[PDB]
Amino acid sequence: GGDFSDPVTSATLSIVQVFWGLDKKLAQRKHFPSVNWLISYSKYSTALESFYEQFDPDFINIRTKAREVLQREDDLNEIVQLVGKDALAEGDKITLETAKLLREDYLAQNAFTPYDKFCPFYKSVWMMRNIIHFYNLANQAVEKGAGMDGQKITYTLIKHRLGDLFYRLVSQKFEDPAEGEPALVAKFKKLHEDLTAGFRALEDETR
Amino acid sequence: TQIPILTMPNDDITHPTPDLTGYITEGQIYIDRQLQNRQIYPPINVLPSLSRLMKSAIGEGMTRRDHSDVSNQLYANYAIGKDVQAMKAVVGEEALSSEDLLYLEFLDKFERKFVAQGAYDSRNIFQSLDLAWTLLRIFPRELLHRIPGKTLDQYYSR
Amino acid sequence: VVPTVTMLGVMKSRLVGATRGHALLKKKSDALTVQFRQILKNIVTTKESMGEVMKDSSFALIEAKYVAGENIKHIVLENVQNASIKVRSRQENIAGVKIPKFEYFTDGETKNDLTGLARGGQQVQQCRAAYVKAIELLVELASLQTSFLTLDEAIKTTNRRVNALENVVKPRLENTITYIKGELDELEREDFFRLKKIQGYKKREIERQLASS
Numbered sequence: 001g002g003d004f005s006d007p008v009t010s011a012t013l014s015i016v017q018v019f020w021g022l023d024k025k026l027a028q029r030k031h032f033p034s035v036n037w038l039i040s041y042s043k044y045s046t047a048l049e050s051f052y053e054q055f056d057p058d059f060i061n062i063r064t065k066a067r068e069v070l071q072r073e074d075d076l077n078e079i080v081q082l083v084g085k086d087a088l089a090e091g092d093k094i095t096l097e098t099a100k101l102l103r104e105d106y107l108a109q110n111a112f113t114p115y116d117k118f119c120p121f122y123k124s125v126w127m128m129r130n131i132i133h134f135y136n137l138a139n140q141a142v143e144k145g146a147g148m149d150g151q152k153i154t155y156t157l158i159k160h161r162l163g164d165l166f167y168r169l170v171s172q173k174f175e176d177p178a179e180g181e182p183a184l185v186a187k188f189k190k191l192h193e194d195l196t197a198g199f200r201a202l203e204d205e206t207r
Numbered sequence: 208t209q210i211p212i213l214t215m216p217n218d219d220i221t222h223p224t225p226d227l228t229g230y231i232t233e234g235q236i237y238i239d240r241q242l243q244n245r246q247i248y249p250p251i252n253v254l255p256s257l258s259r260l261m262k263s264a265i266g267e268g269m270t271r272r273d274h275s276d277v278s279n280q281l282y283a284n285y286a287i288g289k290d291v292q293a294m295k296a297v298v299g300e301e302a303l304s305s306e307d308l309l310y311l312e313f314l315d316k317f318e319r320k321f322v323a324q325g326a327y328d329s330r331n332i333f334q335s336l337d338l339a340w341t342l343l344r345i346f347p348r349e350l351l352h353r354i355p356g357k358t359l360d361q362y363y364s365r
Numbered sequence: 366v367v368p369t370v371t372m373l374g375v376m377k378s379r380l381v382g383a384t385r386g387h388a389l390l391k392k393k394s395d396a397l398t399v400q401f402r403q404i405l406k407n408i409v410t411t412k413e414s415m416g417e418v419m420k421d422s423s424f425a426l427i428e429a430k431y432v433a434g435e436n437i438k439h440i441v442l443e444n445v446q447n448a449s450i451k452v453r454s455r456q457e458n459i460a461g462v463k464i465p466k467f468e469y470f471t472d473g474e475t476k477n478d479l480t481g482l483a484r485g486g487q488q489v490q491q492c493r494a495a496y497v498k499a500i501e502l503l504v505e506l507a508s509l510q511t512s513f514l515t516l517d518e519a520i521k522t523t524n525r526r527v528n529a530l531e532n533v534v535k536p537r538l539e540n541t542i543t544y545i546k547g548e549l550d551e552l553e554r555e556d557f558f559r560l561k562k563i564q565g566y567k568k569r570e571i572e573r574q575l576a577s578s
Contacts (some may be wrong), residue, residue, distance in 0.1 A: 003370050004217070005216065005371075010217075014214075024534075038244065048471040067245075067246055068245055068246060069243065071244045071245050072455055075241070078382060078385075079297070079389070082386045082390070083296070083390075083393070085294065086458075086461055086462075087298060088299075089299060089300055106283075178415075191377065217374070219374075293392065293394075294392055294393075297389050297390075297392065297461070298391070298393060298396060298460055299458065299460075299461050301459070301460075302396060302400075302459070
Protein backbone atom coordinates (compact mmCIF):
# COMPACT_ATOMS: atom_id res chain seq x y z
CA GLY A 1 0.00 0.00 0.00
CA GLY A 2 2.80 2.43 0.77
CA ASP A 3 4.99 4.07 -1.84
CA PHE A 4 7.61 1.83 -3.44
CA SER A 5 10.11 4.71 -3.25
CA ASP A 6 10.65 4.06 0.46
CA PRO A 7 14.40 3.88 1.20
CA VAL A 8 14.21 0.24 2.29
CA THR A 9 12.31 -0.65 -0.88
CA SER A 10 14.69 1.34 -3.08
CA ALA A 11 17.71 -0.31 -1.46
CA THR A 12 16.24 -3.78 -1.87
CA LEU A 13 15.26 -3.38 -5.53
CA SER A 14 18.81 -2.22 -6.22
CA ILE A 15 20.34 -5.57 -5.29
CA VAL A 16 17.46 -8.06 -5.36
CA GLN A 17 16.95 -9.70 -8.75
CA VAL A 18 13.33 -10.86 -8.32
CA PHE A 19 10.53 -8.65 -6.98
CA TRP A 20 7.17 -10.37 -6.47
CA GLY A 21 5.27 -7.12 -6.05
CA LEU A 22 1.85 -7.83 -4.57
CA ASP A 23 -1.02 -5.51 -5.45
CA LYS A 24 -3.35 -3.91 -2.92
CA LYS A 25 -6.06 -3.71 -5.58
CA LEU A 26 -5.68 -7.43 -6.30
CA ALA A 27 -5.92 -8.18 -2.58
CA GLN A 28 -9.12 -6.13 -2.40
CA ARG A 29 -10.24 -7.90 -5.57
CA LYS A 30 -9.88 -11.08 -3.46
CA HIS A 31 -7.44 -12.39 -6.07
CA PHE A 32 -5.55 -14.63 -3.68
CA PRO A 33 -2.10 -14.82 -5.37
CA SER A 34 -2.30 -11.00 -5.60
CA VAL A 35 0.93 -10.85 -7.62
CA ASN A 36 1.01 -7.86 -9.93
CA TRP A 37 2.11 -8.88 -13.42
CA LEU A 38 3.38 -5.40 -14.34
CA ILE A 39 5.60 -4.11 -11.53
CA SER A 40 7.01 -7.55 -10.72
CA TYR A 41 10.10 -8.78 -12.56
CA SER A 42 12.66 -11.58 -12.44
CA LYS A 43 16.12 -10.67 -13.74
CA TYR A 44 17.15 -14.35 -13.57
CA SER A 45 15.41 -15.03 -16.90
CA THR A 46 18.54 -15.33 -19.05
CA ALA A 47 20.13 -17.97 -16.82
CA LEU A 48 17.16 -20.36 -17.00
CA GLU A 49 17.30 -20.41 -20.82
CA SER A 50 19.05 -23.79 -20.93
CA PHE A 51 16.65 -25.26 -18.36
CA TYR A 52 13.59 -24.11 -20.28
CA GLU A 53 15.06 -25.31 -23.58
CA GLN A 54 15.78 -28.80 -22.25
CA PHE A 55 12.36 -28.93 -20.58
CA ASP A 56 10.18 -27.44 -23.33
CA PRO A 57 11.62 -25.29 -26.14
CA ASP A 58 8.23 -23.80 -27.05
CA PHE A 59 7.68 -22.50 -23.51
CA ILE A 60 9.75 -19.34 -24.03
CA ASN A 61 7.76 -18.08 -27.01
CA ILE A 62 4.38 -18.81 -25.42
CA ARG A 63 5.51 -17.04 -22.25
CA THR A 64 6.51 -14.00 -24.30
CA LYS A 65 3.16 -14.07 -26.10
CA ALA A 66 1.32 -14.22 -22.78
CA ARG A 67 3.36 -11.27 -21.51
CA GLU A 68 2.55 -9.29 -24.66
CA VAL A 69 -1.16 -10.08 -24.33
CA LEU A 70 -1.15 -8.97 -20.69
CA GLN A 71 0.70 -5.77 -21.59
CA ARG A 72 -1.74 -4.97 -24.39
CA GLU A 73 -4.71 -5.55 -22.10
CA ASP A 74 -3.25 -3.29 -19.42
CA ASP A 75 -2.42 -0.63 -22.01
CA LEU A 76 -5.83 -0.50 -23.68
CA ASN A 77 -7.73 -0.79 -20.39
CA GLU A 78 -7.39 2.99 -20.14
CA ILE A 79 -8.67 3.42 -23.70
CA VAL A 80 -11.70 1.18 -23.18
CA GLN A 81 -12.42 2.96 -19.89
CA LEU A 82 -12.36 6.30 -21.71
CA VAL A 83 -13.65 5.59 -25.22
CA GLY A 84 -15.67 2.46 -24.58
CA LYS A 85 -15.79 -1.11 -25.87
CA ASP A 86 -17.75 -0.08 -28.98
CA ALA A 87 -14.63 0.71 -31.01
CA LEU A 88 -12.94 -2.54 -29.96
CA ALA A 89 -12.08 -4.71 -32.95
CA GLU A 90 -12.04 -8.49 -33.36
CA GLY A 91 -8.35 -8.63 -32.47
CA ASP A 92 -9.07 -6.47 -29.43
CA LYS A 93 -12.01 -8.73 -28.57
CA ILE A 94 -9.94 -11.93 -28.64
CA THR A 95 -7.14 -10.14 -26.78
CA LEU A 96 -9.54 -9.18 -23.99
CA GLU A 97 -11.00 -12.68 -23.92
CA THR A 98 -7.53 -14.19 -23.54
CA ALA A 99 -6.61 -11.62 -20.89
CA LYS A 100 -9.71 -12.48 -18.85
CA LEU A 101 -8.94 -16.17 -19.34
CA LEU A 102 -5.45 -15.62 -17.96
CA ARG A 103 -6.66 -13.51 -15.03
CA GLU A 104 -9.20 -16.18 -14.05
CA ASP A 105 -7.73 -19.59 -14.95
CA TYR A 106 -3.99 -19.00 -14.81
CA LEU A 107 -2.84 -16.27 -12.43
CA ALA A 108 -5.49 -17.25 -9.85
CA GLN A 109 -4.56 -20.16 -7.56
CA ASN A 110 -6.82 -20.64 -4.54
CA ALA A 111 -4.41 -23.12 -2.87
CA PHE A 112 -7.16 -24.09 -0.39
CA THR A 113 -8.27 -26.95 -2.66
CA PRO A 114 -6.43 -30.14 -3.67
CA TYR A 115 -6.44 -29.23 -7.37
CA ASP A 116 -5.08 -25.74 -6.62
CA LYS A 117 -2.94 -26.47 -3.54
CA PHE A 118 0.13 -27.17 -5.68
CA CYS A 119 0.59 -26.60 -9.40
CA PRO A 120 3.48 -28.58 -10.90
CA PHE A 121 5.43 -27.03 -13.75
CA TYR A 122 4.13 -29.59 -16.25
CA LYS A 123 0.53 -28.54 -15.58
CA SER A 124 1.38 -24.83 -15.63
CA VAL A 125 3.18 -25.06 -18.98
CA TRP A 126 0.30 -27.02 -20.52
CA MET A 127 -2.33 -24.52 -19.35
CA MET A 128 -0.31 -21.60 -20.72
CA ARG A 129 0.25 -23.50 -23.97
CA ASN A 130 -3.49 -24.12 -24.30
CA ILE A 131 -4.34 -20.46 -23.69
CA ILE A 132 -1.71 -19.23 -26.15
CA HIS A 133 -2.77 -21.80 -28.74
CA PHE A 134 -6.39 -20.67 -28.46
CA TYR A 135 -5.24 -17.07 -28.85
CA ASN A 136 -3.21 -17.97 -31.95
CA LEU A 137 -6.10 -19.89 -33.51
CA ALA A 138 -8.47 -17.00 -32.87
CA ASN A 139 -5.95 -14.60 -34.41
CA GLN A 140 -5.63 -16.75 -37.53
CA ALA A 141 -9.41 -17.14 -37.79
CA VAL A 142 -10.15 -13.41 -37.52
CA GLU A 143 -7.24 -12.72 -39.87
CA LYS A 144 -8.66 -14.98 -42.58
CA GLY A 145 -11.93 -13.00 -42.76
CA ALA A 146 -13.06 -14.37 -46.12
CA GLY A 147 -16.20 -15.79 -47.70
CA MET A 148 -18.34 -12.67 -47.13
CA ASP A 149 -17.78 -13.16 -43.39
CA GLY A 150 -15.16 -13.47 -40.67
CA GLN A 151 -13.26 -10.99 -38.51
CA LYS A 152 -15.65 -9.84 -35.75
CA ILE A 153 -18.30 -12.18 -37.14
CA THR A 154 -15.78 -15.01 -36.85
CA TYR A 155 -14.98 -13.90 -33.30
CA THR A 156 -18.64 -13.98 -32.27
CA LEU A 157 -19.10 -17.32 -34.05
CA ILE A 158 -16.16 -18.98 -32.28
CA LYS A 159 -17.46 -17.44 -29.05
CA HIS A 160 -20.77 -19.23 -29.57
CA ARG A 161 -19.94 -22.14 -31.88
CA LEU A 162 -16.77 -23.05 -29.97
CA GLY A 163 -18.05 -22.03 -26.54
CA ASP A 164 -17.48 -25.50 -25.08
CA LEU A 165 -13.71 -25.33 -25.54
CA PHE A 166 -13.65 -21.82 -24.08
CA TYR A 167 -15.64 -22.95 -21.05
CA ARG A 168 -13.52 -26.03 -20.37
CA LEU A 169 -10.31 -24.02 -20.67
CA VAL A 170 -11.43 -22.58 -17.33
CA SER A 171 -12.08 -26.08 -15.97
CA GLN A 172 -8.53 -27.04 -17.00
CA LYS A 173 -7.55 -25.40 -13.71
CA PHE A 174 -9.74 -27.89 -11.83
CA GLU A 175 -7.82 -30.83 -13.31
CA ASP A 176 -6.39 -32.55 -10.24
CA PRO A 177 -2.58 -32.85 -10.28
CA ALA A 178 -2.75 -35.80 -7.88
CA GLU A 179 -4.17 -37.98 -10.67
CA GLY A 180 -0.62 -38.31 -11.98
CA GLU A 181 1.52 -36.55 -14.57
CA PRO A 182 1.02 -39.02 -17.47
CA ALA A 183 -2.77 -38.82 -17.14
CA LEU A 184 -2.79 -35.03 -16.94
CA VAL A 185 -0.41 -34.77 -19.90
CA ALA A 186 -2.66 -37.08 -21.92
CA LYS A 187 -5.75 -35.05 -20.99
CA PHE A 188 -4.05 -31.77 -21.91
CA LYS A 189 -2.76 -33.23 -25.19
CA LYS A 190 -6.31 -34.33 -26.00
CA LEU A 191 -7.57 -30.84 -25.16
CA HIS A 192 -4.91 -29.33 -27.44
CA GLU A 193 -5.86 -31.74 -30.23
CA ASP A 194 -9.53 -30.77 -29.84
CA LEU A 195 -8.56 -27.09 -29.90
CA THR A 196 -6.67 -27.74 -33.15
CA ALA A 197 -9.82 -29.44 -34.43
CA GLY A 198 -11.57 -26.26 -33.41
CA PHE A 199 -10.93 -23.34 -35.76
CA ARG A 200 -10.09 -25.98 -38.35
CA ALA A 201 -13.66 -27.17 -38.84
CA LEU A 202 -14.56 -23.51 -38.34
CA GLU A 203 -11.98 -22.88 -41.05
CA ASP A 204 -13.63 -25.53 -43.24
CA GLU A 205 -17.10 -24.03 -42.80
CA THR A 206 -15.63 -20.63 -43.81
CA ARG A 207 -18.21 -18.96 -41.54
CA THR B 208 33.59 9.69 -24.28
CA GLN B 209 31.51 9.28 -21.12
CA ILE B 210 28.39 7.11 -21.05
CA PRO B 211 27.16 6.84 -17.45
CA ILE B 212 24.40 4.32 -16.79
CA LEU B 213 22.46 6.23 -14.13
CA THR B 214 19.52 4.46 -12.53
CA MET B 215 16.54 6.76 -12.15
CA PRO B 216 14.84 6.17 -8.78
CA ASN B 217 11.06 5.68 -8.68
CA ASP B 218 11.09 5.15 -12.48
CA ASP B 219 11.30 8.88 -13.19
CA ILE B 220 13.82 11.65 -13.83
CA THR B 221 12.26 13.96 -11.23
CA HIS B 222 14.65 12.44 -8.70
CA PRO B 223 17.52 14.79 -7.73
CA THR B 224 20.31 12.68 -9.25
CA PRO B 225 18.71 12.15 -12.72
CA ASP B 226 17.75 15.83 -12.96
CA LEU B 227 21.21 16.93 -11.84
CA THR B 228 23.04 14.67 -14.28
CA GLY B 229 20.70 15.77 -17.07
CA TYR B 230 21.50 19.40 -16.28
CA ILE B 231 25.24 18.67 -16.31
CA THR B 232 25.31 16.38 -19.35
CA GLU B 233 24.23 16.95 -22.95
CA GLY B 234 22.12 13.90 -23.80
CA GLN B 235 19.39 11.60 -22.59
CA ILE B 236 18.83 8.09 -23.91
CA TYR B 237 15.97 6.28 -22.21
CA ILE B 238 14.89 2.75 -21.35
CA ASP B 239 11.13 2.35 -21.70
CA ARG B 240 9.53 0.00 -19.18
CA GLN B 241 6.80 -0.93 -21.67
CA LEU B 242 9.26 -2.17 -24.30
CA GLN B 243 10.83 -4.52 -21.76
CA ASN B 244 7.30 -5.49 -20.73
CA ARG B 245 6.49 -6.02 -24.40
CA GLN B 246 9.75 -8.04 -24.47
CA ILE B 247 11.95 -6.09 -26.87
CA TYR B 248 15.51 -6.80 -25.76
CA PRO B 249 16.66 -3.24 -26.53
CA PRO B 250 14.04 -1.35 -24.51
CA ILE B 251 15.42 1.94 -25.81
CA ASN B 252 12.75 4.63 -25.74
CA VAL B 253 13.40 6.19 -29.14
CA LEU B 254 10.97 9.10 -28.74
CA PRO B 255 12.44 10.25 -25.38
CA SER B 256 15.90 9.50 -26.80
CA LEU B 257 17.87 12.54 -27.91
CA SER B 258 21.46 13.68 -28.37
CA ARG B 259 22.31 17.38 -28.37
CA LEU B 260 25.30 17.01 -30.73
CA MET B 261 23.62 14.70 -33.26
CA LYS B 262 24.45 17.07 -36.13
CA SER B 263 28.19 17.02 -35.35
CA ALA B 264 28.35 13.22 -35.29
CA ILE B 265 26.67 12.80 -38.68
CA GLY B 266 28.53 13.93 -41.79
CA GLU B 267 29.74 12.98 -45.24
CA GLY B 268 33.27 11.93 -44.33
CA MET B 269 32.14 10.19 -41.13
CA THR B 270 28.82 8.32 -41.49
CA ARG B 271 26.70 8.66 -44.63
CA ARG B 272 25.07 11.87 -45.82
CA ASP B 273 21.52 10.50 -45.55
CA HIS B 274 22.02 9.52 -41.90
CA SER B 275 20.60 12.68 -40.32
CA ASP B 276 17.79 12.85 -42.88
CA VAL B 277 16.65 9.28 -42.23
CA SER B 278 17.00 9.87 -38.49
CA ASN B 279 14.59 12.81 -38.62
CA GLN B 280 12.24 11.00 -41.02
CA LEU B 281 12.08 7.88 -38.84
CA TYR B 282 11.49 9.95 -35.70
CA ALA B 283 8.63 11.92 -37.26
CA ASN B 284 7.13 8.81 -38.86
CA TYR B 285 7.28 6.92 -35.55
CA ALA B 286 5.46 9.76 -33.79
CA ILE B 287 2.86 9.72 -36.57
CA GLY B 288 2.56 5.95 -36.21
CA LYS B 289 1.88 6.24 -32.49
CA ASP B 290 -0.75 8.89 -33.18
CA VAL B 291 -2.35 6.67 -35.84
CA GLN B 292 -2.34 3.73 -33.42
CA ALA B 293 -4.28 5.89 -30.98
CA MET B 294 -6.62 6.89 -33.81
CA LYS B 295 -7.18 3.24 -34.76
CA ALA B 296 -7.96 2.49 -31.12
CA VAL B 297 -10.50 5.30 -30.80
CA VAL B 298 -12.27 5.04 -34.18
CA GLY B 299 -12.20 1.26 -34.68
CA GLU B 300 -9.59 1.37 -37.51
CA GLU B 301 -12.27 1.40 -40.24
CA ALA B 302 -12.25 5.19 -40.63
CA LEU B 303 -8.50 5.17 -41.27
CA SER B 304 -7.25 6.01 -44.75
CA SER B 305 -4.53 4.18 -46.67
CA GLU B 306 -1.79 6.44 -45.30
CA ASP B 307 -2.92 5.67 -41.75
CA LEU B 308 -2.54 1.95 -42.45
CA LEU B 309 0.88 2.70 -43.94
CA TYR B 310 1.96 4.43 -40.73
CA LEU B 311 0.56 1.58 -38.65
CA GLU B 312 2.44 -1.10 -40.57
CA PHE B 313 5.57 1.06 -40.53
CA LEU B 314 5.42 1.27 -36.74
CA ASP B 315 4.82 -2.48 -36.51
CA LYS B 316 7.77 -3.29 -38.79
CA PHE B 317 9.95 -0.77 -36.93
CA GLU B 318 9.25 -2.38 -33.56
CA ARG B 319 9.61 -5.85 -35.08
CA LYS B 320 12.97 -5.31 -36.79
CA PHE B 321 14.80 -2.07 -36.00
CA VAL B 322 14.08 -1.78 -32.27
CA ALA B 323 14.56 -5.48 -31.48
CA GLN B 324 18.20 -6.52 -31.85
CA GLY B 325 19.96 -9.74 -30.98
CA ALA B 326 21.92 -9.48 -27.75
CA TYR B 327 24.91 -10.89 -29.64
CA ASP B 328 23.88 -9.60 -33.07
CA SER B 329 26.15 -6.80 -34.28
CA ARG B 330 25.20 -4.27 -36.95
CA ASN B 331 27.54 -1.81 -38.61
CA ILE B 332 26.16 1.71 -38.88
CA PHE B 333 26.01 1.19 -42.65
CA GLN B 334 23.98 -1.97 -42.03
CA SER B 335 21.74 -0.07 -39.62
CA LEU B 336 21.14 2.62 -42.24
CA ASP B 337 20.36 -0.09 -44.79
CA LEU B 338 17.83 -1.63 -42.40
CA ALA B 339 16.21 1.75 -41.76
CA TRP B 340 16.05 2.31 -45.52
CA THR B 341 14.39 -1.08 -46.02
CA LEU B 342 11.83 0.05 -43.47
CA LEU B 343 11.47 3.27 -45.45
CA ARG B 344 10.83 1.69 -48.86
CA ILE B 345 7.28 0.78 -47.84
CA PHE B 346 6.28 4.44 -47.89
CA PRO B 347 5.77 6.11 -51.27
CA ARG B 348 8.48 8.46 -52.49
CA GLU B 349 6.31 11.56 -52.07
CA LEU B 350 5.29 10.52 -48.56
CA LEU B 351 8.84 10.97 -47.18
CA HIS B 352 8.41 14.72 -46.78
CA ARG B 353 11.32 15.12 -44.37
CA ILE B 354 13.79 13.47 -46.76
CA PRO B 355 15.58 16.06 -48.94
CA GLY B 356 15.30 15.86 -52.69
CA LYS B 357 17.98 14.13 -54.78
CA THR B 358 18.82 12.14 -51.67
CA LEU B 359 15.52 10.27 -51.64
CA ASP B 360 15.98 9.15 -55.25
CA GLN B 361 19.58 8.33 -54.33
CA TYR B 362 18.51 5.54 -51.96
CA TYR B 363 14.74 4.99 -52.27
CA SER B 364 15.45 3.36 -55.64
CA ARG B 365 16.91 0.30 -53.87
CA VAL C 366 -4.72 14.16 0.45
CA VAL C 367 -1.52 12.95 2.11
CA PRO C 368 1.49 15.04 1.00
CA THR C 369 3.43 11.76 0.76
CA VAL C 370 5.24 11.11 -2.51
CA THR C 371 2.85 8.24 -3.26
CA MET C 372 -0.04 10.69 -3.63
CA LEU C 373 2.16 13.01 -5.70
CA GLY C 374 3.01 10.17 -8.07
CA VAL C 375 -0.63 9.09 -8.27
CA MET C 376 -1.73 12.64 -9.10
CA LYS C 377 1.02 13.03 -11.71
CA SER C 378 0.00 9.76 -13.37
CA ARG C 379 -3.65 10.83 -13.31
CA LEU C 380 -2.78 14.15 -14.94
CA VAL C 381 -0.68 12.47 -17.64
CA GLY C 382 -3.42 9.96 -18.39
CA ALA C 383 -5.98 12.76 -18.48
CA THR C 384 -3.86 14.69 -20.98
CA ARG C 385 -3.46 11.65 -23.22
CA GLY C 386 -7.17 10.87 -23.02
CA HIS C 387 -8.03 14.48 -23.79
CA ALA C 388 -5.84 14.37 -26.89
CA LEU C 389 -7.44 11.11 -28.04
CA LEU C 390 -10.95 12.44 -27.43
CA LYS C 391 -10.12 15.64 -29.32
CA LYS C 392 -8.93 13.61 -32.31
CA LYS C 393 -12.05 11.44 -32.21
CA SER C 394 -14.30 14.49 -31.93
CA ASP C 395 -12.58 16.13 -34.90
CA ALA C 396 -13.05 13.01 -37.02
CA LEU C 397 -16.71 12.71 -36.01
CA THR C 398 -17.28 16.39 -36.80
CA VAL C 399 -15.75 15.94 -40.26
CA GLN C 400 -18.01 12.95 -40.93
CA PHE C 401 -21.02 14.92 -39.69
CA ARG C 402 -20.11 17.79 -42.01
CA GLN C 403 -19.97 15.40 -44.98
CA ILE C 404 -23.34 13.92 -43.99
CA LEU C 405 -24.74 17.44 -43.68
CA LYS C 406 -23.52 18.26 -47.19
CA ASN C 407 -25.22 15.13 -48.56
CA ILE C 408 -28.43 15.99 -46.68
CA VAL C 409 -28.30 19.53 -48.09
CA THR C 410 -28.03 18.13 -51.61
CA THR C 411 -30.99 15.84 -50.97
CA LYS C 412 -33.03 18.74 -49.56
CA GLU C 413 -32.23 20.76 -52.68
CA SER C 414 -33.54 17.84 -54.74
CA MET C 415 -36.64 17.88 -52.50
CA GLY C 416 -39.46 20.17 -53.61
CA GLU C 417 -38.32 19.87 -57.21
CA VAL C 418 -39.09 16.19 -56.66
CA MET C 419 -42.71 17.06 -55.84
CA LYS C 420 -42.85 19.50 -58.76
CA ASP C 421 -41.82 16.67 -61.08
CA SER C 422 -44.31 14.34 -59.36
CA SER C 423 -47.25 16.68 -60.04
CA PHE C 424 -46.67 16.18 -63.77
CA ALA C 425 -47.46 12.48 -63.36
CA LEU C 426 -50.82 13.34 -61.77
CA ILE C 427 -51.57 15.82 -64.56
CA GLU C 428 -50.73 13.15 -67.15
CA ALA C 429 -52.97 10.64 -65.36
CA LYS C 430 -55.85 13.12 -65.36
CA TYR C 431 -55.29 13.87 -69.05
CA VAL C 432 -55.05 10.23 -70.15
CA ALA C 433 -57.07 8.03 -67.79
CA GLY C 434 -59.04 10.78 -66.05
CA GLU C 435 -60.08 9.76 -62.55
CA ASN C 436 -57.95 7.15 -60.81
CA ILE C 437 -59.19 3.74 -59.71
CA LYS C 438 -59.55 5.13 -56.17
CA HIS C 439 -60.47 3.01 -53.11
CA ILE C 440 -58.04 0.11 -52.49
CA VAL C 441 -56.64 0.07 -56.03
CA LEU C 442 -56.21 3.86 -56.37
CA GLU C 443 -54.32 3.33 -59.67
CA ASN C 444 -51.55 5.79 -60.68
CA VAL C 445 -48.73 3.31 -59.92
CA GLN C 446 -46.72 1.41 -62.52
CA ASN C 447 -43.59 0.83 -60.42
CA ALA C 448 -42.02 1.49 -57.00
CA SER C 449 -43.77 -1.03 -54.78
CA ILE C 450 -43.38 -0.14 -51.12
CA LYS C 451 -40.67 -2.54 -49.95
CA VAL C 452 -37.39 -1.44 -48.40
CA ARG C 453 -34.24 -2.73 -46.67
CA SER C 454 -32.34 -0.78 -44.01
CA ARG C 455 -29.42 -1.73 -41.78
CA GLN C 456 -27.50 0.01 -39.01
CA GLU C 457 -23.82 0.37 -39.92
CA ASN C 458 -21.09 1.43 -37.51
CA ILE C 459 -19.17 4.38 -38.97
CA ALA C 460 -16.51 6.19 -36.91
CA GLY C 461 -17.50 4.03 -33.95
CA VAL C 462 -21.19 4.99 -34.14
CA LYS C 463 -23.94 2.81 -35.60
CA ILE C 464 -25.67 4.64 -38.46
CA PRO C 465 -28.90 3.21 -39.93
CA LYS C 466 -28.65 2.96 -43.71
CA PHE C 467 -32.31 3.79 -44.29
CA GLU C 468 -32.81 2.66 -47.90
CA TYR C 469 -36.48 3.28 -48.73
CA PHE C 470 -38.57 2.46 -51.81
CA THR C 471 -36.99 2.76 -55.29
CA ASP C 472 -33.68 1.95 -53.52
CA GLY C 473 -34.78 -0.83 -51.13
CA GLU C 474 -35.01 -4.56 -51.70
CA THR C 475 -38.15 -6.40 -52.91
CA LYS C 476 -39.33 -3.46 -55.05
CA ASN C 477 -41.92 -4.54 -57.62
CA ASP C 478 -43.53 -3.08 -60.73
CA LEU C 479 -46.68 -3.94 -62.72
CA THR C 480 -46.20 -2.90 -66.36
CA GLY C 481 -47.22 0.67 -67.14
CA LEU C 482 -50.47 2.63 -66.99
CA ALA C 483 -51.62 5.41 -69.31
CA ARG C 484 -49.52 7.71 -67.14
CA GLY C 485 -47.78 4.84 -65.35
CA GLY C 486 -44.53 5.72 -67.08
CA GLN C 487 -44.92 9.33 -65.96
CA GLN C 488 -45.58 8.11 -62.41
CA VAL C 489 -42.46 5.93 -62.50
CA GLN C 490 -40.37 8.82 -63.84
CA GLN C 491 -41.83 11.23 -61.28
CA CYS C 492 -43.27 9.47 -58.23
CA ARG C 493 -40.78 6.59 -58.15
CA ALA C 494 -37.87 9.02 -58.53
CA ALA C 495 -39.22 10.84 -55.48
CA TYR C 496 -38.98 7.54 -53.60
CA VAL C 497 -35.35 7.16 -54.68
CA LYS C 498 -34.65 10.67 -53.38
CA ALA C 499 -36.53 9.94 -50.15
CA ILE C 500 -34.44 6.82 -49.49
CA GLU C 501 -31.27 8.90 -49.42
CA LEU C 502 -33.08 11.63 -47.50
CA LEU C 503 -34.07 9.24 -44.71
CA VAL C 504 -30.65 7.57 -44.57
CA GLU C 505 -28.87 10.93 -44.43
CA LEU C 506 -31.29 12.32 -41.84
CA ALA C 507 -30.80 9.36 -39.51
CA SER C 508 -27.02 9.41 -39.97
CA LEU C 509 -26.87 13.17 -39.39
CA GLN C 510 -28.98 12.99 -36.23
CA THR C 511 -26.87 10.17 -34.78
CA SER C 512 -23.61 11.93 -35.72
CA PHE C 513 -24.79 15.23 -34.24
CA LEU C 514 -25.75 13.58 -30.95
CA THR C 515 -22.44 11.71 -30.78
CA LEU C 516 -20.39 14.80 -31.65
CA ASP C 517 -22.23 16.85 -29.03
CA GLU C 518 -21.57 14.19 -26.39
CA ALA C 519 -17.89 13.89 -27.33
CA ILE C 520 -17.37 17.66 -27.43
CA LYS C 521 -19.06 17.99 -24.04
CA THR C 522 -16.82 15.27 -22.59
CA THR C 523 -13.67 16.89 -24.00
CA ASN C 524 -14.61 20.39 -22.85
CA ARG C 525 -15.54 19.08 -19.40
CA ARG C 526 -12.19 17.30 -19.16
CA VAL C 527 -10.19 20.36 -20.22
CA ASN C 528 -12.13 22.74 -17.99
CA ALA C 529 -12.47 20.62 -14.82
CA LEU C 530 -10.25 17.52 -14.70
CA GLU C 531 -6.85 19.04 -15.49
CA ASN C 532 -7.83 22.40 -13.98
CA VAL C 533 -8.42 20.62 -10.67
CA VAL C 534 -5.63 18.04 -10.80
CA LYS C 535 -2.87 20.57 -11.55
CA PRO C 536 -3.71 22.59 -8.39
CA ARG C 537 -3.76 19.29 -6.50
CA LEU C 538 -0.24 18.49 -7.72
CA GLU C 539 0.93 22.02 -6.91
CA ASN C 540 -0.52 21.87 -3.40
CA THR C 541 0.98 18.42 -2.81
CA ILE C 542 4.42 19.62 -3.92
CA THR C 543 4.18 22.78 -1.83
CA TYR C 544 3.06 20.94 1.30
CA ILE C 545 5.57 18.10 0.91
CA LYS C 546 8.57 20.36 0.38
CA GLY C 547 7.81 23.36 2.56
CA GLU C 548 6.75 21.21 5.48
CA LEU C 549 8.74 17.97 5.43
CA ASP C 550 12.03 19.26 4.05
CA GLU C 551 11.95 22.52 5.99
CA LEU C 552 11.10 20.92 9.33
CA GLU C 553 13.52 18.02 8.87
CA ARG C 554 16.35 20.43 8.11
CA GLU C 555 15.35 22.55 11.10
CA ASP C 556 15.33 19.51 13.39
CA PHE C 557 18.76 18.49 12.12
CA PHE C 558 20.11 22.01 12.67
CA ARG C 559 18.68 22.12 16.20
CA LEU C 560 20.29 18.78 16.99
CA LYS C 561 23.60 20.02 15.58
CA LYS C 562 23.37 23.12 17.76
CA ILE C 563 22.57 20.94 20.78
CA GLN C 564 25.70 18.87 20.18
CA GLY C 565 27.74 22.00 19.57
CA TYR C 566 26.86 23.70 22.83
CA LYS C 567 27.19 20.38 24.65
CA LYS C 568 30.78 20.26 23.41
CA ARG C 569 31.15 23.91 24.43
CA GLU C 570 29.94 23.11 27.95
CA ILE C 571 32.34 20.16 28.11
CA GLU C 572 35.21 22.44 27.09
CA ARG C 573 34.16 25.02 29.68
CA GLN C 574 34.05 22.35 32.39
CA LEU C 575 37.49 21.09 31.34
CA ALA C 576 38.85 24.64 31.55
CA SER C 577 37.28 25.03 35.00
CA SER C 578 38.85 21.78 36.23
